[PDB]
Protein: 3,4-dihydroxy-2-butanone 4-phosphate synthase
Amino acid sequence: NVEKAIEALKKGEIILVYDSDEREGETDMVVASQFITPEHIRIMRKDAGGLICTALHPDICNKLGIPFMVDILEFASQKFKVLRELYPNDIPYDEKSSFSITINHRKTFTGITDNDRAFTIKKLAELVKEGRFNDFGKEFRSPGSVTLLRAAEGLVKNRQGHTEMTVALAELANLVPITTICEMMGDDGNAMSKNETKRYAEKHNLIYLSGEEIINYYL
Amino acid sequence: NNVEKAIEALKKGEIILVYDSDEREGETDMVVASQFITPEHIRIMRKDAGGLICTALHPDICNKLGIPFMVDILEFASQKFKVLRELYPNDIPYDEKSSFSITINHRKTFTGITDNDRAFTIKKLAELVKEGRFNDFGKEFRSPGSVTLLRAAEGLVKNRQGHTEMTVALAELANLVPITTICEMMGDDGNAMSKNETKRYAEKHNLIYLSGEEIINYY
Ligand SMILES: O=C(CO)[C@H](O)[C@H](O)COP(=O)(O)O
Ligand SMILES: O=C(CO)[C@H](O)[C@H](O)COP(=O)(O)O
Ligand SMILES: [Ca+2]
Ligand SMILES: [Ca+2]
Ligand SMILES: [Ca+2]
Ligand SMILES: [Ca+2]
Ligand SMILES: [Zn+2]
Ligand SMILES: [Zn+2]
Ligand SMILES: [Zn+2]
Structure:
């Protein structure tokens, strides 16, 4: 199943990845960022509905100098004390946020359109694939509409969220290890259930993958 | 006229549409008074508008809670994270500054992104403010989260004319807690939904549609 998903990812398709019954119980739509298109963004906002985020392998984040947002906030809590009052000291270690900074490519206008978000994401994957790390500040500004996620060092060995699972899948596919993901939201106000997301994958001829399978394959 | 009609709609917990200006973003946001937000509002915003779902706060509330602008958090944190300096938004194309602030989740939510979770976070924030329980902010919320806050400029539309200021101004005029939730309407072609298409939406759904100039002049 993992290898079939890898082929789909290599063709620029959206695949569906469920994490686990014990974790978020959520399914994310996932695409290899180097193949992102405005159409992928349109499908994610209409049929998934969560935040459209782009996850990056830790090696990439280290080359760009991008930290976890929690660390930006903790340091800034020295000046803005409310940040200390909002510390996420109550989240299980396994669910600790993978949130990093938000960005827009400088050539975009408001940054939120399908065209703007696909351009921001595709240009970031381009810059990374080409190794033009120093061009990051030249080409992008923060804050913006595309939320970046920082994958755990060691990926699924140390954290088992969609952030790590999808980046691990891109690494396995021999692609730039950067993915764009969006949580699938249900009409009942909760996340779409695994039965509901498997159903959507069947209707749209998409690959549906369980996180356990990616983890096992990777390890 | 239409502004008074939009005010009555907000007081009833309905959504209104606000277009800023041809000379600014050229975008229409769906708008609702946060104290009346429901999971259904979040659902219609993600399916029918599609941009980010953000909650704008009157600067008075922001000062009482100690919530700063995000660019300021980044500016201060750049002392430690050098990448932040190179990402300065000294070039946002449609205004001097962004209204982006911190992101939050109410501590009682699970993943924070569902319609139920986002509506709960936003409504609870509006309630905490309405009840003057500012010392309870950290007790009830954590950052980062799925709900992005926006800080309205001091003087509102007298000093900045974004949807952030315009909508907070309408909530104030309505004698409501001045906190709004807004979402940009996106088009199928990859650009923001056109003025003509957002008008057709407003006519189909009998929603009040306002332009920025009318709100600014009335305020
Ligand atoms: O938080 C999220 C996006 O903002 C989603 O849960 C997304 O799937 C990435 O997070 P995680 O790695 O915890 O699954
Ligand atoms: O940026 C945005 C959301 O994050 C949107 O533009 C929203 O309408 C608020 O911004 P502004 O006050 O500039 O119109
Ligand atoms: Ca998560
Ligand atoms: Ca804006
Ligand atoms: Ca201005
Ligand atoms: Ca009508
Ligand atoms: Zn997830
Ligand atoms: Zn706007
Ligand atoms: Zn209707």
Remarks:
- The radius of gyration of chain B is 17 Å.
- Chain B has one domain: 1-219.
- Residues B 203, 206 surround calcium ion (ligand 6) (CB under 6 Å).
